[PDB]
Amino acid sequence: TMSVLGHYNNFFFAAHLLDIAMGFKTLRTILSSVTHNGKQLVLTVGLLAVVVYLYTVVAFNFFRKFYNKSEDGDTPDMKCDDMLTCYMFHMYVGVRAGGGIGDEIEDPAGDEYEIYRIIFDITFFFFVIVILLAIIQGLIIDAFGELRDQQEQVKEDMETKCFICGIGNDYFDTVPHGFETHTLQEHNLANYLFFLMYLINKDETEHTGQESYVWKMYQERCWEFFPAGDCFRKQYEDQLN
Amino acid sequence: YQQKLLNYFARNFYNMRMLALFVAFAINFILLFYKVSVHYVLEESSGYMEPTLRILAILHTIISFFCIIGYYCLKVPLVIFKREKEVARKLEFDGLYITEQPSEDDIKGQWDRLVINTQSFPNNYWDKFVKRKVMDKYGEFYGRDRISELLGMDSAVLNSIDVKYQMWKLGVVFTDNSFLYLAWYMTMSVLGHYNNFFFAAHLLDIAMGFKTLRTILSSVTHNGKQLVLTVGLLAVVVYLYTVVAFNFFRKFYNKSEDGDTPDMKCDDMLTCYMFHMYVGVRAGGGIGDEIEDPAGDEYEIYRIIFDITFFFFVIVILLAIIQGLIIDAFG
Amino acid sequence: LLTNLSEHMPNDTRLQTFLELAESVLNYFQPFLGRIEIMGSAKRIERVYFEISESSRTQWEKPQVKESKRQFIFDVVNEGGEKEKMELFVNFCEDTIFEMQLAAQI
Ligand SMILES: [Ca+2]
Ligand SMILES: [Zn+2]
């Protein structure tokens, strides 16, 4: 669709650059980090919205003369009078500035509403900016870190544990080059694949005892012929231990 | 019919809560459509907005009253039964008011002392014979008279309704957290009719819904003592910086509108302290982003050291520590 | 037969001499010979020596098969459910057999 639309206006080919994010793995992890913690992120954004709305209600009721965002005073006054303008002003400039809504509102010096205004400003800054922005950032970053840690744990489990047969590394490594030889030759994966394919290819009349037994168990979908914590070196302990 | 209505309210309770939340959302939308000129709702050529707000406020108050009645019918017996079971098992197995005389603070035991000398003490414990076992053993040891006086065993007209027991029940009811929250809900819904803006506070009921909102809210109080003490340390270090600035660098605090105007300085202690705690702790870089530039003065290296030490110490260490405390509590 | 005798009989100098006589044919038939241990029959580990075709080995290294293997390994050791582990291993085996059959149409 985007490639077809690119011929209408030759700018829609910019959206094809995002195909690089479906290439290298870390780009895919970064993109999936946003949706990995989805419900919590949406609910935190909603909490941010409702607390900003409460601050908007308080400012609308009490401090309305302070919102004189005019170009150096004596011009046609551009204020924030109605609810919607104040709410958009708080959600657009209040949540972005480094310090809260106090960095844009006129200085409250000499007014009777001085301590109340200072408390409003400090509480806004602290609560919404610090707690909620840090919480959202931590949610996304922790999702990314958790995904990377899961991938690393998967790699470590593959490199230190027998996939089938579930023993571990310290058991096969008593002999030189033990675990690597075990995974390569004894309890392999492609070997099991090729054995299943060989069973499917061969006729039922030519099956040996073990092959017929495995075929029967596979036909009945009853898997006990797989090793369940035992191997040749454990049962048939070399020279009978 | 009264019992049927009470049982119906005790049945449909969470549905009433969700209805209250939706009505609060609608009322807050209508509030979002306000405008000043005095306060009148701007309506896009539709006069239905104000009657809708009126009927929504009335129906919200009614629904919240139904909610509190349903909660009083539903889960108050659980609290009553739990407390009765605890006090009865304590008095039987151990015995507090007869041979132990509980500790100085012991607010729960001090309040529960009023219920042992009542005619309907085991109203919900379904074990209305623990008085006999207690009287037996503790009157055979500590005398029968003290047990008898302490325990006090010996149209719908007024049968005195066990006034002492009712007072004890009301006292234990006005201590549960959920009942206090619903009482606050009642208070805010009632006050919403005086000024139709107090319905904004009902939006916080969404934080008692989904679990992650409750975890976020409880994260603030999870690390309470450490947070308060860190805020106190911030206050005292800002005060020390205020003392130093008051003593030495006072000509630099000329927060005037482009120079030659009536000078608005920070001369006294309180103004300097509020200036440091209001603008100093918020700006991205410390108090140096607002003070005049120290170029050419004899107090140049001292001023630079003051500025850098303020910025680094208070902003970096203390703000990062407070933020880390809250975030680590959440995690 | 020689591999079975050598593995089942660990200490026999005569079998050792036979192995040093037939090491060349053993090296040639090494890429084609498998090795698998099962619980099948009785209550002991056995060995299920079998044959691997050239086509099966030359279609195992196709990029699609490698990608499917990586995805299956990640999805079966990340969550696991370690009886659905074996169930999904068998299912992945069937799917990879189908993919080798499809890739045979080159
Ligand atoms: Ca046969
Ligand atoms: Zn193994």
UniProtKB/Swiss-Prot annotation, chain B:
<protein>
    <recommendedName>
        <fullName>Ryanodine receptor 2</fullName>
    </recommendedName>
</protein>
<feature type="transmembrane region" description="Helical">
    <location>
        <begin position="61"/>
        <end position="81"/>
    </location>
</feature>
<feature type="transmembrane region" description="Helical">
    <location>
        <begin position="18"/>
        <end position="37"/>
    </location>
</feature>
<comment type="subunit">
    <text>Homotetramer. Can also form heterotetramers with RYR1 and RYR3. Interacts with CALM and S100A1; these interactions regulate channel activity. Identified in a complex composed of RYR2, FKBP1B, PKA catalytic subunit, PRKAR2A, AKAP6, and the protein phosphatases PP2A and PP1. Interacts directly with FKBP1B, PKA, PP1 and PP2A. Interacts with FKBP1A and FKBP1B; these interactions may stabilize the channel in its closed state and prevent Ca(2+) leaks. Interacts with SELENON. Identified in a complex, composed of FSD2, CMYA5 and RYR2.</text>
</comment>
<feature type="transmembrane region" description="Helical">
    <location>
        <begin position="229"/>
        <end position="249"/>
    </location>
</feature>
<feature type="intramembrane region" description="Pore-forming">
    <location>
        <begin position="280"/>
        <end position="289"/>
    </location>
</feature>
<feature type="transmembrane region" description="Helical">
    <location>
        <begin position="190"/>
        <end position="210"/>
    </location>
</feature>
<comment type="similarity">
    <text>Belongs to the ryanodine receptor (TC 1.A.3.1) family. RYR2 subfamily.</text>
</comment>
<comment type="function">
    <text>Cytosolic calcium-activated calcium channel that mediates the release of Ca(2+) from the sarcoplasmic reticulum into the cytosol and thereby plays a key role in triggering cardiac muscle contraction. Aberrant channel activation can lead to cardiac arrhythmia. In cardiac myocytes, calcium release is triggered by increased Ca(2+) cytosolic levels due to activation of the L-type calcium channel CACNA1C. The calcium channel activity is modulated by formation of heterotetramers with RYR3. Required for cellular calcium ion homeostasis. Required for embryonic heart development.</text>
</comment>
<feature type="transmembrane region" description="Helical">
    <location>
        <begin position="310"/>
        <end position="330"/>
    </location>
</feature>
